Design a protein around this nucleic acid. Sequence first.
DNA 1: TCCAAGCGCAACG
DNA 2: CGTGCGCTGGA
Length: 258
Amino acid sequence: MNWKEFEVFCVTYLNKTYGNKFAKKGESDSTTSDILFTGNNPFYIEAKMPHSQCGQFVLIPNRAEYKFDYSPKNKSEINPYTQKIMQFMSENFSEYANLSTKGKIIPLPESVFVNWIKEYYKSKSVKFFITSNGDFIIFPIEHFEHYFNVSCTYRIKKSGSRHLNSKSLPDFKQALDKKGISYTMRGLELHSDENIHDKRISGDDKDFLIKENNGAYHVKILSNTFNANVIFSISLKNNISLFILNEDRKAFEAAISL
DNA sequence: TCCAAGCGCAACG
DNA sequence: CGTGCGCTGGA
Ligand SMILES: [Ca+2]
């Protein structure tokens, strides 16, 4: 299944096992998780597939000072583990200053990255993670290292898309005309009997992406921002201690009962 | 309202 | 197993 189906799978399990107290609804944002326990001891639960990413921060190369600057637009504050990563990269500036989409791994002790993850998720009121290796695994953030292997890389990650808007509609219609695609627009919704799912077309310094929705196509404008971020990858361990697993399930059962 | 940017997410070539 | 779109400050 994909990650969206996986998150629904996790929420459904929580509600059927522990009662209808686990919300995944409404708007989200990066300062919180996607699943909220709505009891007297509220907290967020992070669902992670066995192979996932697990947080990031943008660093800007300063080629005059030969160091990396923490982006003032990042959404989490510098903690000591952020500082260790930045210090390592800055002391090795030449090796990290040529940004790449392939990325360059950061060979610091895994505990530095685990500690960054713990700090970051604690700061977002994420107290537990849920994953699955065939059975559901729920554990508190303080025991993260017993469940996931962690690595860290610095890579260009292009920023995300935005919905086609009225201001861009003329350029998009003209891009369709240029590409020879037969179409009709109903507001910002695109209609065509051509097979244009995932189609990319460009015009007037905008790269457009076309995706099939219920009965029509939705149009997105892709980004032109190509900054680089430290970003964490996690892989579920094959050898999780059953003793830790059991005490961690009891920790969760305590947390939802306070 | 719109755009740049950062964080969400494993996806997929 | 070695790359970026969907979503959410300030002008
Ligand atoms: Ca990595």
